[PDB]
């Protein structure tokens, strides 16, 4: 406590309303600089000079169509430092080349780092096992793979997910049309993890709320629990019987149940991260070659896979001109892939 | 295929009920990971070092297998005290509530887009002083929807509108 | 002290009958003055296009980006 | 000294008014197709 480092450590780890910790020296600035940056970029900054779009409430957009659009494609993978050779210290030109996206993303990466360090620090000081910091590794993997490694494998930051709602929907459909990411088995494992985690959440909540022990005489049973009680508030045996005789199998071990609840979403996120890392290099599970050859030689062979491939071609051709204005794609109506009538 | 055609014809992504469903599943994953992490993190020591921690719990035991106070305090320090669910029954009700309500809403959204009450259409919603359209992300999403619309069922449509 | 204990205190509201509306109006004059369009470079409703610039403006070089930005944003 | 139920009532009323002004701006002026 006497030493200066000990004094700083004592103050940082003080038990107050907002725990600061040493990690707070990395979290609170960057996180703040991220969030306000988004609130700045989605409120005043435009995408007119990078995407040809309006992306601010000032330009007229709403919560859906407002976004912090990615930098211009000509920027490549520049760090887009405000003092860098692109903006050269000019705030206005920096915002106009979409450098605010680089600001938000690079500060958000370190904000995620600081928050995981915060989880580790609070787990250490409180004295519990650090399983919450390792479950946030899933979200960290998602952010790193989708916002950093994907554009770094592509031509520029331009193809990163623009920070918005409609921007993210455009990213979803762009990735589907150009990579066919639904066919990617790693995406399949990820959506399996997500939907299974939601399933586990719902079933666990219902089962626990519906095998509660009668610890009161009130019809509303929330007040019949004490935080410090050393008694389980619901019947594990009754829930096990219910799910065993309804579904054939059932959890018998609470610790296994709660580790499973952790493992499913985290495994899903990491699996889908592998798929997006694959998509960064255009290593895409785009096609099944056997069916492509059969449909090439058999013009009566049709599958839902081939219909999806045609839809992807439609997405690419009808989206490229307005989605990649830097390419200057002029596709006449003759060459655009169409169908009869509509 | 059904997904892509549904997006092309109804714009389900911009429809707010599907957004509530996305919130439901993402929040279900978030709360599943969080709850599992905090229960696994505060497991009471009932196991030796050469033995799986799960065997510290015996089926049908009367005592709690983890310290609710420890997890509650850790999560309170993580964000703020008021956010944490000090009550376990309320916690599990919320766990059962969030994904169920989200999936109810998205199922209802698909039920309503069955009768063609589509998601939002902000196409050409921003125009300059002259009155020419400045594109937004809604327009760029519309381009993908239009590509899927034109390419779906290439031989089935004989008339310009996809009313059926 | 607890949140509700502060909110119901009269002093809180003697402070925030004046402090909060001041900045709520400061934002109003921030944008109504047109100052946001100048700080952040956002075109006004009458600045997306201009003579010889009836097409979308795009930066096509990394290092001369400022130069062509002035050139395009000469106005 | 001020009952917190009245504070909550007035604050929620004002917040709903602000969101409704946002909704009106959504049906009027810039950002509206008209």
């Amino acid at each position: 406590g006497r030493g200066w480092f000990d004094l700083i450590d004592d103050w940082l780890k003080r038990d107050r309303f907002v725990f600061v910790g040493w990690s707070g020296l990395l979290l609170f600035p960057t996180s703040y600089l991220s969030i306000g940056g988004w609130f700045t970029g989605t409120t005043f900054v435009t995408s007119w000079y990078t995407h040809g779009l309006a992306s601010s409430y000032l330009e007229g957009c709403n919560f859906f169509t407002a976004a912090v659009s990615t930098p211009a494609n000509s920027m490549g993978h520049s760090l887009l430092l405000l003092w860098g050779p692109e903006a050269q210290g000019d705030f206005t030109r920096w915002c106009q080349i979409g450098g605010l996206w680089a600001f938000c993303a690079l500060h958000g990466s370190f904000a995620l780092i600081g928050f995981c360090l915060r989880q580790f620090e609070i787990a250490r000081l409180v004295g519990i096992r650090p399983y919450n910091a390792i479950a946030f590794s899933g979200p960290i993997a998602i952010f790193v793979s989708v916002f950093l490694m994907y554009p770094l494998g592509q031509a520029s930051w331009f193809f990163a997910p623009s920070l918005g709602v409609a921007a993210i929907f455009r990213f979803l459909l762009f990735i589907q049309g150009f990579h066919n990411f639904t066919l990617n088995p790693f995406h399949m494992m990820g959506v399996a993890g997500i939907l299974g985690a939601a399933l586990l959440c719902a079933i666990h909540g219902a089962t626990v709320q519906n095998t509660i022990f009668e610890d009161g005489d009130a019809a509303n049973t929330f007040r019949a629990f004490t935080p410090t009680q050393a008694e389980e508030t619901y019947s594990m045996v009754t829930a096990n019987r219910f799910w065993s005789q309804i579904f054939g199998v059932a959890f018998s071990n609470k610790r296994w149940l709660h580790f499973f609840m952790l493992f499913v979403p985290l495994a899903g996120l990491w699996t889908s991260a592998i798929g997006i890392v694959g998509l960064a290099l255009n290593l895409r599970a785009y096609d099944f070659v056997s069916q492509e050859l059969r449909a090439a030689e058999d013009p009566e062979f049709e599958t839902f896979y081939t219909k999806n491939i045609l839809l992807n071609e439609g997405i690419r051709s009808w989206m490229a001109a307005q989605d990649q204005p830097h390419e200057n794609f002029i596709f006449p109506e003759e060459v655009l892939p169409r169908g009869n009538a509509l | 295929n059904f997904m892509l055609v549904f997006q092309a014809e109804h714009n389900i992504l911009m429809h707010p009920f599907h957004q509530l469903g996305v919130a439901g599943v993402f929040g279900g994953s978030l709360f599943s990971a969080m709850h599992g992490s905090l229960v696994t993190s505060s497991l009471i020591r009932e196991t030796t070092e050469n033995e799986s921690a799960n065997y510290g719990y015996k089926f049908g035991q009367e005592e709690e297998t983890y310290n609710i106070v420890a997890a509650h305090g850790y999560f309170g320090r993580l964000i703020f005290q008021y956010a944490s669910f000090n009550n376990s029954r309320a916690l599990h009700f919320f766990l059962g509530l969030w994904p169920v309500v989200g999936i109810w809403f998205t199922a209802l959204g698909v039920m309503t887009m069955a009768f063609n009450l589509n998601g939002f259409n902000f196409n050409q919603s921003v125009v300059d002083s002259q009155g020419r359209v400045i594109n937004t992300w809604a327009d760029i999403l519309n381009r993908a929807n239009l590509g899927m619309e034109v390419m779906h069922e290439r031989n089935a449509h004989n008339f310009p509108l996809d009313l059926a | 002290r607890p949140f509700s204990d502060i909110i119901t205190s009269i002093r809180y509201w003697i402070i925030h009958s004046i402090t909060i509306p001041a900045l709520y109006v400061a934002g109003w004059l921030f944008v109504s003055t047109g100052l946001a369009y100048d700080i952040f470079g956002t075109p006004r409703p009458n600045e997306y296009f201009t003579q010889d610039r009836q097409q979308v403006p795009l930066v096509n070089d990394r290092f001369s980006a400022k130069q062509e930005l002035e050139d395009l944003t000469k106005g | 000294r001020i009952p917190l139920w009245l504070i909550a009532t007035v604050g929620g009323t004002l917040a709903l008014t602000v969101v409704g002004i946002f909704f009106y701006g959504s049906y009027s002026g810039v950002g509206s197709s008209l």
Binding site: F39 | - | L23, G27, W28 | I21, F22, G25
Partner: peptide
């Protein structure tokens, strides 16, 4: 002042941006 700093760092930009947004509703093209 750390409580003041945190809560007001959250609040002051929030009210400033909300005033700007409520003004921005009236830009009227």
């Amino acid at each position: 002042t750390f409580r003041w700093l945190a809560i007001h760092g959250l609040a002051v930009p929030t009210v400033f941006f909300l005033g700007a947004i409520t003004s921005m509703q009236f830009i009227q093209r």
